[PDB]
Design a protein around this ligand. Structure first.
Ligand code: ZN
Ligand code: ZN
Ligand code: ZN
Ligand code: ZN
Lengths: 109, 263, 331, 405, 191
């Protein structure tokens, strides 16, 4: 479902709305607004990569100049593969919402 | 604690023909016999309860819902309310070409739900036996058969015995209802003497009926006629899709309009 | 009743032989409580449809034992359930052995007739001689519907078996909840597209008595502890005396069904009209409930789809449970 | 008798049921049913008591190792299935440097049943084989079935590129002593035993991917609950409304007659409380009591039940045996009739059916000479009527075959 | 400790009873054996037979692989993860952290053990629509020093009644929870 951060609309493939997800998005937006690293505690049941990527992509679309590139680091190689696959699914939903062709470049090493 | 519910099928046209005949038996006499039987049922046990219902051609009316002559006050009051109800319903009737015959099935359906609400009102610890007495003078209706069958099944599920007495002609629907319920079925040759027949078999409680010797219920034949050409068949093919009897096998089944699958 | 339903249903009942049934998770021991509820379910299933038949198999120590043969008589099944309480019911049951024998029995039964198997498991753990997954593939190939009921447990394997055969997995949360599941089982499930549907020849046997006071009566004995059967139903195809009218002739293979039994299943074809329930009077047309001709003692109004006659809660519950018709529509 | 084996099988079926044995004896005297045919009917069943078997799916060798006390205990049979190599070794030793009795002597020998060596019990040797084969499957052998994944080293990228990183102790071979080393061996036996139990039953990223495919989508999304349950629509509800039983009463009148009947009923209902109907009631009651009482006329009472015979129950039992034998023959004739296929082979089957039916009629005639003559009862007429119905169907088949010719 | 506990269990009539309830799949030092035990544990769950896997919270292999909800409905934690053979390196680091910053040595050790323990505990839940049981067998969790180190979202789920449960009482509460979650959840209920 479309979520308004006041700069961009976030599109969710699951289309599932949770009070915890809404609270997390508001807190993450405050961390995004003020530059300076930071540590955020997110529940295990929610997928960390899917939730983090959707807000980051919306912020990047709203402010392309601020972030030249996005880097994701995972402890294990299967987790690296999972992040890429989830990003690809998120892009496909974004492509359906926006223009028919929405090219995006993702690399796993 | 025994509940006796009396349902009488009253047809103004049939009763009017009886009045034109000028036979000693009259619709008024039939109700008087029912009231005397009801007073006796209440008299034998105070716990025993009596409910009286009369079926009009297009509607069903419940007749049942001091000691001036020294008669028991409860019996006198019960008879008085029934007398007002019966006279009001019979005096005014509406003639309908579509429905010149009273609907027994509609009255029976009302009686079964009325017994069900009364059973809920009755305390679980006390035990109530429910029986239905049916007196029918009206002709049976082929259209009413579908409605009639469902009420018999409702009585069987609720374990309510149905006992039926026919003043003039036995009815196939009525006899089938008694057979499925297991209630005794009786035919009365003399209409004026109907009250005496009611006292001997219908009035006694189920425990009393076993102790006494009462005439056995008439055996009911089972007849299957295909509705295709309204013709009776010893063997009839039954379509799986619509469960309808067929005199002969049909490549296409008319009742559901589906075509039978052929290998 | 809008969906197609099977007029003849060969439902099969499987009862767990595990020691878990002996363990009392519920206040009574599970084996006795399940058997008593099964006895009520068997009577309700036969009452709902006379043509439909039930067969009971119990697996004990991974060996399949047939508790009762498939039959149209509920009492025989009830007696077998009482015997099951007597049995030790010790050792893990074999899901594979019971299903294979039940499937083989169903294969003999005609494809057009609906064939179904119901399994009750008191233990999440399943132990069998052969792999369960291989049997599930065989069940998918066969025209059989399998529904599994777990007792106070949820099993992925049982759910997979049920979904593949089109059956619905169930959990026994409460003894009362189990009765509701059994009531759903008593109702015929919608016929699958795979299941064959065809017209079936029916023989109607009118009862034959001893003519007139044993006038050259054909005195019989036991033609499927009896006496001299002079007044009995005759199978139309082979003219053989039969003790019970709703019994398929064994030699002919032709089912015999009475006209009232067909009339009982007529209600299944057409769904009862739903009655809308409103707590508010909402300018109710009749203060008195139409069914009992008495004013409502509670603020509940039931409105029929067509006639819209007033129904009290007691009348509405009774009409769906037994009447199977709308009283206002009948008038 | 046909084959001596077929005759023994028929005898076993007769032994199982006393009612069946009497029916078989009557058929044998008639010659209507062959002994081989009776054996085929007896062997006409489904599967066995345990059909396939009763193998366990967990702790098969740990069920009752040397605690239950070849093909003796089902426990040892499950153990033989659990380890194929142990079963093969036992079979080879059976006639070589050992006997079955010698194996039993070894089974209860000290350090095995006495559990004085290698702890365990009778699954001690099985556990030794398990541990050894598990170590071989971790060294010599590996993951035979390994596709896109379904492996271990291949599943986790490439084994462990730990080319001398910082973590390696884990598998510290140089350090295994006895107590801890023995516990590690016990884990190896358990892991192999679980694989062996799976082997007894049937004679990783890829797995996770298959589960993901099953989770994706829904049965309802595909079609519905029960595949595609077709809707049921009935063209004529009126046909159901009509009753199959014939209309008992169906009469009508003119509209003017209905008005006249209404007028009379309105007048009749207004008249009420005659009161002096007692004289009519008393006369009516006197007529009713005689009919209602069991004594006198107008009483429906039958049930004569006058079976004048010697022992009626014994005669009924004899009839039941005759009915069972005749019914089995009728079932065979009906199966032949079902497969019409008018041909030379069908005509031969019809001739055999006729012969058996005639022999059954001769048995019914002999039964009439028995208890229908001595005890003057045994009404074999009904049994003869059932045979006549089968003959009538056979005659109808002959007519159809003549029309086909 | 896990190997020693298994050896004590085998001598007592406890491990044999556990084996009857669920097939045993103890983790092994060899990497290939540990992978085989995990795959066998998954196969038993697919079969529907009870499966129990004994694992080390401290070990990295447990951290790397997250148990699937179907494979592992309930996760049990025994004690608090610690290294018996831990060298002076950890102790030297704790002193260095104290001098450079303001970190209590005891607080850091409790936090380090808890972050590993919490990750192992939170493998039962992979999705919002899932049922999982988390059990702690250590008294320090009841004291609450361990509870504070545990993540706030887990603490919100944790209850005082759940804290200091008797062994029989905890099993009974878990059985009641499983019966409640046995009925299927609905999307509207989530919303
Ligand atoms: Zn049809
Ligand atoms: Zn027949
Ligand atoms: Zn009402
Ligand atoms: Zn209506």
């Amino acid at each position: 479902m479309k979520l308004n951060v006041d700069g961009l609309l976030v599109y969710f493939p699951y289309d599932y709305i949770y009070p915890e997800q809404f609270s997390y998005m508001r807190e993450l937006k405050r961390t995004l607004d003020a530059k300076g690293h930071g540590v955020l505690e997110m529940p295990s049941g929610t997928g960390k990569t899917v939730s983090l990527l959707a807000l980051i992509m919306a912020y990047q679309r709203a402010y392309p100049l601020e972030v030249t590139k996005l880097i994701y680091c995972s402890r294990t190689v299967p987790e690296i593969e999972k992040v890429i696959e989830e990003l690809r699914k998120l892009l496909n939903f974004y492509e359906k919402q926006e223009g028919e062709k929405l090219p995006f470049l993702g690399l796993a090493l | 604690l025994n509940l006796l519910v009396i349902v009488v099928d009253a047809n103004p046209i049939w009763w009017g023909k009886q009045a034109l005949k000028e036979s000693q038996f009259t619709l008024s006499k039939c109700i008087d016999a029912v009231m005397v039987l009801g007073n006796s049922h209440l008299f034998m046990n105070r716990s025993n309860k009596l409910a009286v219902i009369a079926s009009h051609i297009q509607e069903s009316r419940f007749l049942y819902p001091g000691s001036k002559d020294g008669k028991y006050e409860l019996l006198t009051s019960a008879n008085e309310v029934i007398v007002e109800e019966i006279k009001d319903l019979m005096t005014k009737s509406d003639i309908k070409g579509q429905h010149t015959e009273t609907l027994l099935a509609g009255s029976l359906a009302k009686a079964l739900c009325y017994i069900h609400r009364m059973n809920k009102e009755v305390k679980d610890n006390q035990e109530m036996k429910s029986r239905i007495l049916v007196i029918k003078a009206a002709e049976d209706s082929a259209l009413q058969y579908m409605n009639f069958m469902n009420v018999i099944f409702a009585a069987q599920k609720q374990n309510i015995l149905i006992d039926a007495c026919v003043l003039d002609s036995d009815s196939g629907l009525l006899q089938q209802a008694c057979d499925i319920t297991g209630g005794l079925y009786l035919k009365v040759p003399q209409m004026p003497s109907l009250l005496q027949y009611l006292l001997w078999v219908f009035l006694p409680d189920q425990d009393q009926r076993s102790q006494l010797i009462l005439p056995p219920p008439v055996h009911v034949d089972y007849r299957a006629a295909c509705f295709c050409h309204r013709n009776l068949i010893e063997i009839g093919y039954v379509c799986s899709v619509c469960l309808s009897i067929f005199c002969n096998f049909s490549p296409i089944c008319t009742t559901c309009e589906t075509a039978f699958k052929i290998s | 009743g809008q969906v197609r339903l099977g007029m003849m249903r060969h439902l099969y009942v499987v009862v767990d032989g595990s020691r878990t049934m002996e363990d009392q998770d519920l206040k009574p021991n599970r084996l006795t409580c399940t058997l008593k509820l099964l006895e009520y379910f068997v009577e309700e299933y036969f009452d709902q449809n006379p043509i439909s038949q039930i067969g009971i198999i119990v697996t004990k120590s991974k060996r399949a034992e047939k508790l009762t043969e498939l039959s149209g008589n509920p009492r025989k099944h009830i007696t077998s359930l009482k015997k099951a309480v007597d049995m030790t019911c010790h050792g893990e049951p074999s899901l594979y052995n019971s299903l294979s024998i039940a499937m083989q029995t169903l294969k003999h039964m005609p494809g057009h007739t609906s064939r179904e198997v119901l399994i009750i498991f008191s233990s999440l753990t399943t132990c069998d001689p052969s792999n369960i997954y291989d049997l599930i593939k065989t069940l998918k190939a066969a025209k059989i519907r399998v529904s599994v009921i777990g007792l106070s447990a949820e099993v992925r394997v049982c759910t997979v078996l049920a979904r593949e055969t089109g059956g619905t997995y169930h959990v026994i949360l409460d003894e009362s909840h189990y009765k509701e599941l059994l009531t759903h089982h008593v109702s015929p499930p919608p016929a699958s597209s795979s299941s064959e549907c065809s017209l079936i020849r029916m023989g109607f046997p009118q009862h034959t008595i001893a003519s007139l006071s044993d006038q050259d009566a054909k005195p019989s004995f036991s033609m499927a502890e009896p006496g001299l059967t002079l007044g009995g139903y005759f199978c139309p195809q082979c003219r053989a005396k039969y003790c019970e009218l709703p019994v398929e002739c064994k030699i002919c293979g032709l089912t015999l069904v009475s006209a009232p039994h067909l009339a009982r299943s007529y209600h299944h074809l057409f769904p009862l009209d739903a009655f809308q329930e409103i707590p508010l009077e909402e300018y109710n047309g009749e203060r008195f409930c139409y069914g009992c001709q008495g004013e409502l003692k509670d603020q509940h109004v039931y409105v029929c789809a067509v006639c819209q006659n007033v129904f009290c809660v007691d009348c509405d519950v009774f009409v769906h449970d037994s009447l199977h018709c709308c009283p206002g529509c009948i008038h | 008798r046909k084959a001596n084996k077929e005759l023994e099988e028929k005898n076993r079926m007769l032994q199982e049921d006393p009612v069946l044995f009497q029916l078989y004896k009557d058929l044998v005297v008639s010659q209507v049913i062959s002994a081989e045919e009776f054996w085929a009917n007896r062997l006409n069943v489904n599967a066995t008591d345990s059909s396939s078997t009763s193998n366990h799916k967990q702790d098969v060798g740990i069920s009752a190792a040397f605690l239950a006390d070849n093909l003796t205990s089902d426990i040892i049979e499950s153990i033989f299935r659990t380890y194929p190599a142990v079963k093969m070794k036992y079979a080879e030793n059976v006639p070589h440097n050992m006997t079955e009795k010698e194996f039993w002597t070894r089974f209860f020998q000290s350090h095995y049943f006495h559990r004085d060596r290698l702890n365990t019990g009778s699954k001690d040797l099985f556990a030794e084989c398990a541990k050894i084969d598990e170590k071989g499957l971790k060294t010599m052998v590996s993951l035979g079935v390994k596709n896109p994944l379904l492996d271990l080293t291949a599943l986790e990228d490439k084994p462990l590129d730990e080319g001398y990183g910082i973590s390696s102790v884990p598998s510290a071979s140089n350090s295994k002593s006895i107590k801890e080393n023995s516990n590690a061996a016990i884990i190896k036996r358990f892991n192999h035993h679980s694989a062996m139990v799976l082997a007894a039953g049937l004679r990783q990223p890829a797995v996770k991917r298959a589960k993901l495919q099953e989770s994706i989508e829904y049965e309802d999304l595909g079609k519905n609950n029960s595949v595609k349950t077709i809707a049921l629509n009935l063209k004529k509800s009126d046909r159901y409304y009509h009753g199959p039983t014939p209309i008992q009463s169906l009469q009508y009148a003119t509209s003017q007659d209905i008005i006249n009947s209404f007028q009379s009923i309105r007048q009749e209902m207004e008249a009420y409380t005659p009161k002096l109907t007692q004289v009519l009631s008393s006369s009516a009651a006197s007529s009713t009591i005689t009919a209602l009482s069991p004594g006198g006329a107008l009483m429906q009472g039958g049930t004569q039940q006058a079976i004048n015979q010697m022992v009626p129950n014994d005669i009924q039992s004899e009839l039941k045996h005759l009915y069972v034998a005749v019914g089995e023959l009728l079932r065979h004739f009906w199966s032949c009739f079902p497969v019409n296929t008018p041909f030379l082979e069908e005509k031969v089957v019809k001739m055999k059916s006729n012969l058996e039916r005639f022999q059954v009629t001769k048995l019914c005639p002999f039964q009439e000479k028995i208890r229908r003559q001595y005890l003057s009862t045994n009404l074999v007429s009904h049994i003869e009527e059932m045979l006549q119905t089968a003959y009538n169907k056979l005659h109808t088949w002959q007519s159809r075959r003549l029309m086909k010719k | 400790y896990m190997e020693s506990t298994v050896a004590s269990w085998y001598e007592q009539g406890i491990l044999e009873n556990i084996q009857r309830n669920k097939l045993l799949f103890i983790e092994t030092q060899d990497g290939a054996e540990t992978s085989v035990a995990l795959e066998k544990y998954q196969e038993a769950c697919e079969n529907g037979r009870g499966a129990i896997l004994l694992s080390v919270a401290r070990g990295k292999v447990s951290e790397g692989i997250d148990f699937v909800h179907h494979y592992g409905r309930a996760v049990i934690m025994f004690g608090v993860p610690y290294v018996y053979t831990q060298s002076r390196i950890l102790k030297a680091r704790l002193e260095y952290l104290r001098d450079q910053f303001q970190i209590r040595e005891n607080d850091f050790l409790t936090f380090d053990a808890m972050r590993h323990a919490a990750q192992c505990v939170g493998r039962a839940i992979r999705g919002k629509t899932d049922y999982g049981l988390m059990v702690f067998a250590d008294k320090r969790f009841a004291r609450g020093d361990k509870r504070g180190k545990l993540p706030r979202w887990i603490q919100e789920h944790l209850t005082d009644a759940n804290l200091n449960l008797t062994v029989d009482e905890g099993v009974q509460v878990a059985k009641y929870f499983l019966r409640q979650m046995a009925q299927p959840f609905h999307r509207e209920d989530q919303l």
